[PDB]
Design a protein around this ligand. Structure first.
Ligand SMILES: O=C(O)[C@@](O)(COP(=O)(O)O)[C@H](O)[C@H](O)COP(=O)(O)O
Ligand SMILES: O=C(O)[C@@](O)(COP(=O)(O)O)[C@H](O)[C@H](O)COP(=O)(O)O
Ligand SMILES: O=C(O)[C@@](O)(COP(=O)(O)O)[C@H](O)[C@H](O)COP(=O)(O)O
Ligand SMILES: [Mg+2]
Ligand SMILES: [Mg+2]
Ligand SMILES: [Mg+2]
Lengths: 468, 139, 468, 469, 139, 139
């Protein structure tokens, strides 16, 4: 406490003998020190600058229970097969964090440490959110269970589709596409993430025409139907206005984009619970910080944060579609969103044991460049509680939108029926043959299988495991 | 029209052999089965009529098929569905529901439109079968 | 328009002969194609999936003015000294974007393209926001000019300091530290980014004690004073409540954290204009996507987005402090925040010519690991219109907080006075001697210069220029 | 187990001697007196069942739920020492049984029906272990001891107060007079009596405005922050808020509420107090209807926990030596429950569970009723520094006026603490009374008070007593 | 009038021997002492002027008494208070404050009254000493 | 106390030679200079009294010093400040302001506190010089 600079590891931010408490918030960082920076000093610096420290000693620590509030780096391990990169475990006292505030948790955990010169790269890989912090959060407004009860749909993935083209359609035409997709068999459609309100289509025209299409499709089929009406807007006031309008006209669901940001998202998640609305989260912008293994925030952490905030769906990957998704990483995300508790599972990137404290289950959504020919793979990797979304895969069908919709649904039901009978459906013989057998009695599926059979997206992953 | 509630209604009507394999799957998971009837096909008709109690760890899928076939003999023309329930923590809900019987002819529905405020429409889905005749006489 | 998959470059998303319109939104991406992906196809894919395209052809394009709404990649250049990395220029029609909506602009520009398997890395480097889009945004609630008028402070950087330790202080003690720093000479102090409301200090206690300290310091000096009261909260409702409280008690200023997100930020920026409040933006989380050169969003783009949204201050770097900041990149950020228009300046990372459409000027803030001994460097790199913040550099002073404050201010005034006289102050002789000459008659400065003279943070930068 | 009919609660899963308590469980300790012929374990299983998921006959609808998770478990049943056929029963309840942040819901389960069960002749809730994870859902004290003292600029000594008397009948103008006099003569606070709300002899607004003149007058005459607990207790939430808002609008530092308002209104006002920068004093009106007798009801220590959770800033908690019931060991336990950051098992004090307070703020105990300054040594010994000592009759009953009464109490206080801090064995009957006489030689008010009341005591058999020494 | 801030202001002015005993009590609790000065006696003057830093390391009470007598020699006529700080979890606050010095004559205060809405009065407590002269020249 | 408005008030009072170099800097930037006087030191006293008009592209810094010295001879005891104004687009504002004269003795201010709602205080900063005497007679 004499004035001046001393290493973070001498200031109380490194403790190899620290006993982790069940109330602690834990973070796992992948740290790449600058050349010459001690690995333990780097970890202590992340711990200090995300809790109580600055760069020079301050007497004002002595006005506080300083030892309680200092975070502790407690373990630093080399990353397998990754020279001079380290896994650093840090424990944070419960009382550091504002109750029910994602904004506050993130202000500490990600606020400044990623810009420190002394570390050339930093990635938040996982967190243990303690039971006692989780009970301060809502969790899912609806959750998987109540959602399926509202839909009267059980034992099979749900289906969806993004309306295309992305931009340019009028409200009337939007309602046409939604009518056709729903009537052909889809459970949902959705506005594209960038469909908000624009000169070619102001939002009220979209909302009202979509309700006509939705209701028409429900009366034509005897099923509950919906489409994710995008309430994403510039301001909280305008977002609320769009959400209120959707409620007032009877929509089962709305969507929001991650670019709205955490504070707006928590507001809408409370609103959705209060207003009997399903809340779909599109993860717009997520890959700006989640793509690369060396730096940023792993999407599994985002999963925890958004399940806490209380969205009902989140996009979580397809494995076989047009966007990045190593199967081990994806399986990990899906478990984080859907299970009541997590056990350590290093090949899935599950670094901490964690109870979910009975917060409701968040529905993963698999979307982007997928088609019905891959149905066996989607069922295998992703399971029952997922929404499988086919935008181009429905609207791209040469015999029309209802045909696209019908193809996806027949493929899905045929596949689940066979699985439940005990078919080795994931096998490369059996899966595509289940589909061909169904297609012999369904022209739409025959056509879809023929059109897209050669289509795959196989590229090297960036977001990969460190353990096998 | 074809009522497409249930999880296999885009496939052909299931045979008894197909239903039994579904039952066997659910019972192998440890799920409880029940049978329910209605002649109100409305999408929001949450509570179809119970056929007895759910069949809690009955172990033989033949016993579930017996009860389904008893229900088919006793119930009026209409719909029967087969459900599986998972009482586990994290679920405590239905985890499978599919139709085992449907009417030979389902007229379906129309969309009733009331003018609300501004351009809003207040919608009601009306069943042709329900509006014409009382429960037990609709099909 | 026959059904099926065709390359994005055949779908209208590549046009080498495109004539850029003054109303277009332009984006510059640093694209790293996967091996075997054509550089032009990658650029067309980014253009398509951020405008109107999906992965397979859709007939529904034909219901729209499809040619108008398609974005166009119009130029693809190799990056200097960077094998198989490309600079890709893309133009977007004005009508794609919701008026006054950062959420909508970002939904398109960053929404999905960073997760595309076909591109191993993607970075948004710069954007040309057209005059006609800028007039839909507020710009700064107050801006540099009105801010200095409210302060009655001209011709010298403003001074600030973050209260430390980061977490643990009570409200009463917070007010003590703010009183002392302000009375010693600082223009401002501020809550730390992670100081919101917590068990050791609930926010109302901080706000009220701080107003006592602020007002005491103003009566002791005859100057306008303030401290950035942090209104960052979980929900929009709670954020508004804290902002309203700050207004009701007479605070000149509040702060917010970037982790609140864009929708909340735009709401508060409108609120700040409506309520005569200075709005300070802490950039919490920015380095999760802004640090690495291969992937994410360059901070210069964030500068544009936050100047549009209308914050009054944003943290923008120090060069010589504890956080990342190449001087050429920093100078570029500062110009983006402060100038009425931008000319192409490739060594500063200014890739587009751009008029700011008379949106007000945003005050850059230089903060983190800086001390008064560096004053010549700070004046040289950063100029007059900046807030220089010394948290540890004030509170770490061995003779107390008022002494820390006084040292910084004497150093600042001495340096500006000498500069205005024509001293070659940036020179390594003259700068530190100006400070020593002032210190001969000011014990606090003598002590501060002695304590921290050996302190530097020299490490290899990650966020560096491509041109010299 | 799921065939129809009645079976014992102990065979339905509500008894498990091998149950491992989780840190997230709510635990309850009940003193159970079974009817003659009722098995002690079955009685405990009945309490566990009927305060969690059971009824009196088997229901198949259990099987629609994760029934094993939700059943509470009686896990330990001990005989009560020296108390034939009475037992201590410990029961564990799953965290998920309870609505977040809801005292009404917690109490609906724990005390709802089981006290009326025929098969048990007497039941008392003695203690609870409220888990860390439940506590974080509650606000705790709106202000708490630490911020309260910062607002008052008063540290290192008990705070002083006084209930205005007579209880009923004074005008608003005369109320403000008493408050002025009391505060100027040295009291930190006065208060409305618990039954002073709004009445034909004094409508509440008259009280509030006149008291603010008195308070601000005393503050200007002394240089101290002063207040009086303005009673906002009213028939409805609407009227209570109106009174609270009015007190805030005119700048009162503090309001009071009565426990008879009930838990839901109390929680509402405790959130209001945090939001409105107000100190919130709780009078425990009615508490002794269920808390007095050892065989049946709710021990006041549990009420302490519930009220600290709900978030009052003060609660009356006993004096030992005054006119109301208070065994010293029981009282010391109450005070610890209100003031400490955590609790260790301390059976002689009635602390049956170890319990972390989860950084919920500290609740200020209030010692009130039939106490006088001749007792100052005892009050400091039993009760410590963080307490409000209230002398109603002991101020206003002083023969030389209200100011003199106030001054006598404050000089006694300061002289006693000065001497304690100097190392005096002040609780010793040879030392404390002499400290008071010594100060009294130079303070006529104190001499007079000592002469009038020094021999007054209230010594009777306690009903709410310990089971361990 | 006599300013009765502090916890011993209804007792006579403390002698040095008495102050040392209070200091010793606080230091054997492990509390930190500091000394503060003001010439604004207002009850809401939260922040009296610091005399150096609080003495956290200090173990001998005479050291604290030395600093107190240094403050008394240096500061203008007015008030001095002695404080104890407890930084431990659950407190993190002042736990003792008493006046060591007061002016020989304190004129005190008046109550200034502004007519609010209805019968409400808007009150301000004004110091005679502060309204008359600036800091350093008030007593 | 020392009034610390202006940009050089933590340095010693500027000599005429120092002021002239500041003037020269501002005039070399193309900025317009003016001189202003007051004897109300309040932090919110936005509009000090103008000494004539601003000196728009006067080119010789000696002419600015002449006017400053004329103002010093004519104005009552109090404060004089020297400002530079930049009429350029993007600025259109003052870009330099520093004190050229201050009183020999400035008593400074006190903080007047009115009790607002709850715990809020309504603050007014009062000048000792202004409250005692009228403009032109304060120092
Ligand atoms: O804009 C799109 O590309 C989509 O509408 C998919 O359209 P298609 O179904 O026509 O591909 C989705 O937003 C992406 O799936 C988002 O990716 P993720 O789910 O990975 O966040
Ligand atoms: O938490 C901190 O470290 C600071 O309060 C600085 O404290 P010191 O002044 O004591 O370093 C600032 O938030 C950083 O400057 C933010 O970085 P940037 O400005 O780069 O976003
Ligand atoms: O009404 C009364 O008797 C009092 O005003 C005390 O009057 P005196 O000071 O004149 O005795 C208090 O309400 C009791 O102390 C409450 O009891 P407890 O504190 O036990 O709840
Ligand atoms: Mg999309
Ligand atoms: Mg900070
Ligand atoms: Mg009473």
């Amino acid at each position: 406490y004499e004035s001046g600079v001393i290493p973070y590891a001498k200031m109380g931010y490194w403790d190899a003998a620290y006993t982790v408490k069940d109330t602690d918030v834990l973070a796992l960082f992948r740290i790449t020190p600058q050349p010459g920076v001690d690995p333990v000093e780097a970890a202590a610096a992340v711990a200090g600058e995300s809790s109580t420290a600055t760069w020079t000693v301050v007497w004002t620590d002595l006005l506080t229970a300083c030892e309680r509030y200092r975070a502790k780096a407690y373990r630093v391990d080399p990353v397998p097969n990754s020279t001079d990169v380290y896994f650093a475990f840090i424990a944070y006292e419960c009382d550091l964090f504002e109750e029910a505030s994602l904004a506050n948790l993130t202000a500490s955990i990600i606020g400044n440490v990623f810009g420190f010169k002394a570390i050339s790269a930093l990635r938040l890989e996982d967190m243990r959110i303690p039971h006692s912090y989780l009970x301060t959060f809502q969790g899912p407004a609806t959750g998987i269970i109540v959602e399926r009860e509202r839909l009267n749909k059980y034992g099979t993935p749900l289906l969806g589709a993004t309306v295309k083209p992305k931009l340019g359609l009028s409200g009337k035409n939007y309602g046409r596409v939604v009518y056709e997709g729903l009537k052909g068999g889809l459970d949902f459609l959705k506005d594209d993430e960038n469909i908000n309100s624009q000169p070619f289509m102001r939002w009220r025209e979209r909302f009202l025409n979509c309700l006509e299409g939705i209701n028409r499709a429900s009366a034509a089929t005897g099923e509950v139907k919906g489409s994710y009406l995008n309430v994403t807007a510039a301001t909280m006031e305008e977002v609320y206005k769009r959400a209120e309008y959707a409620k007032a006209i009877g929509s089962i669901v709305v969507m929001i984009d991650l670019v709205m940001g955490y504070t707006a998202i928590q507001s809408i998640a409370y609103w959705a619970r209060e207003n009997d609305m399903l809340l779909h989260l599109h993860r717009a912008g997520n890959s700006t910080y989640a793509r690369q293994k060396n730096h940023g925030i792993n999407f599994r952490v985002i999963c925890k944060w958004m399940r806490m905030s209380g969205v009902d769906h989140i996009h979580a990957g397809t494995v076989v579609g047009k966007l990045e998704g190593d199967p081990l990483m994806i399986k990990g995300f899906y478990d984080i969103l859907r299970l009541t508790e997590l056990e350590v599972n290093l090949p899935f990137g599950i670094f901490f044991e964690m109870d979910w404290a009975s917060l409701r289950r968040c529905m993963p959504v698999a979307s982007g460049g997928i088609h019905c020919g891959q149905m066996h793979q989607l069922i295998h990797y992703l399971g029952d509680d997922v929404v499988l979304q086919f935008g181009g895969g429905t609207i791209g069908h040469p015999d029309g939108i209802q045909a696209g919709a019908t193809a996806n649904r027949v493929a899905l039901e045929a596949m689940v029926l066979a699985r439940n009978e005990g078919a080795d459906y994931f096998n490369n013989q059996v899966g595509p043959q289940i589909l061909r057998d169904a297609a012999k009695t369904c022209g739409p599926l025959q056509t879809a299988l023929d059109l897209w059979k050669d289509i795959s997206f196989n590229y090297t992953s960036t977001d990969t495991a460190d353990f096998s | 029209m074809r009522l497409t509630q249930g999880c296999f209604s885009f496939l052909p009507d299931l045979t008894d052999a197909q239903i039994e394999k579904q039952v066997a799957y659910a019972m192998s998971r440890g799920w409880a089965m029940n049978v329910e009837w209605t002649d109100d096909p409305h999408p929001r008709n949450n509570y179809w009529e119970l056929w007895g109690l759910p069949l809690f760890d009955i172990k033989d899928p033949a016993t579930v098929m017996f009860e389904l076939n008893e229900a088919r003999k006793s119930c009026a023309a209409g719909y029967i569905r087969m459900n599986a329930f998972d009482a586990s923590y994290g679920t405590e809900s239905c985890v499978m529901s599919f139709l085992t019987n449907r009417p030979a002819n389902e007229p379906g529905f129309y969309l009733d439109r009331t003018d609300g405020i501004g351009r809003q429409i207040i919608y009601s889905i009306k069943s042709y079968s329900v509006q014409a005749n009382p429960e037990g006489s609709r099909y």
